[PDB]
RNA sequence: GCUUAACUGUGGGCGUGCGGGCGAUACGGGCAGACUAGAGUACUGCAGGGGAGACUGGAAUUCCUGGUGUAGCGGUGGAAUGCG
C-alpha cells in the first residue's frame, strides 16, 4: 500500500450524513466512511451518533494507512459537526484545524423552491 | 253680497320679470400699462442603487475532462420512487 503522514478530514457534512472522507495533502480521498457506511440509512443516517460512528471508522482506516496528523476539512451544515469532530480525536487523528469548508454562491444560481412538510 | 257657508262681485297688493333712459366705480372683468415676493433662467457646489447603453469578474451551481477513492448517496416524520 502506501502511507499518508498528514491527511485532511473532508466531512461532508450533509443533514442526511457525516461522508467523512479522509484526503490525502494531495487531494485524493484516501478513504471515506459515512452513515451508511457504518450501516446508517434513512433518519439513522442523520442521527448523530452515525457521526462519530463515520468519523471513527474512517479514522480507523486512516490509521490502517499509518495516519495521524490531521486537519479537518468540515462542508457544510448537517448532523454532528463537533460528534465527529471529537470521534476523529479520539480514533487516532488529532484535530488540527477546523476549517468550515462551505460552497459561498454569493447570490449567484438558483435552487429549488422550497419544502412545506 | 250669495239665508250662513261654499260662491260671486269690487278694488289693492301682487304680477318677483324684461326692456329704455339716467348713476355708481368698491370688486370682478376689459384696455393701457408698471413692479418683483409668485413663477422661470444663471452662478457656484451637494446625494446617487435615476435611467439607458458598451466592457469585465469570479463565487457558486450543474454538466463535461483527468485523477484518488469507496457501497453508498440523495430522498422523508419514515418510506419508496432516483442513481450508484
Same mark, same amino acid.
Given at each position: 500500500?502506501?502511507? &499518508?503522514? =498528514?491527511?485532511?478530514? =473532508?466531512?461532508?457534512?450533509?443533514?442526511?450524513?457525516? %461522508? &467523512?472522507? %479522509?484526503? #490525502? @495533502?494531495?487531494?485524493?480521498?484516501?478513504?471515506?466512511?459515512?452513515?451508511? =457506511?457504518?450501516?446508517?440509512?434513512?433518519?439513522?443516517?442523520?442521527?448523530?451518533?452515525?457521526?462519530?460512528?463515520?468519523?471513527?471508522?474512517?479514522?480507523?482506516?486512516?490509521? $490502517? =494507512?499509518?495516519?495521524?496528523?490531521? #486537519?479537518?476539512?468540515?462542508?457544510? @451544515?448537517?448532523?454532528?459537526?463537533?460528534?465527529?469532530?471529537?470521534?476523529?480525536?479520539?480514533?487516532?487523528? $488529532?484535530?488540527?484545524?477546523?476549517?468550515? &469548508?462551505? @460552497?459561498? @454562491?454569493?447570490?449567484?444560481?438558483?435552487?429549488?423552491?422550497?419544502?412545506?412538510?
Amino acid at each position: 500500500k502506501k502511507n &499518508v503522514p =498528514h491527511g485532511a478530514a =473532508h466531512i461532508k457534512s450533509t443533514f442526511n450524513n457525516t %461522508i &467523512v472522507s %479522509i484526503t #490525502d @495533502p494531495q487531494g485524493n480521498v484516501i478513504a471515506w466512511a459515512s452513515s451508511g =457506511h457504518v450501516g446508517f440509512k434513512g433518519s439513522r443516517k442523520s442521527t448523530p451518533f452515525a457521526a462519530q460512528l463515520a468519523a471513527e471508522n474512517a479514522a480507523r482506516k486512516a490509521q $490502517e =494507512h499509518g495516519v495521524k496528523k490531521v #486537519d479537518v476539512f468540515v462542508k457544510g @451544515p448537517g448532523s454532528g459537526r463537533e460528534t465527529a469532530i471529537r470521534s476523529l480525536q479520539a480514533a487516532g487523528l $488529532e484535530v488540527g484545524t477546523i476549517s468550515d &469548508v462551505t @460552497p459561498q @454562491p454569493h447570490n449567484g444560481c438558483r435552487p429549488p423552491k422550497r419544502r412545506r412538510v
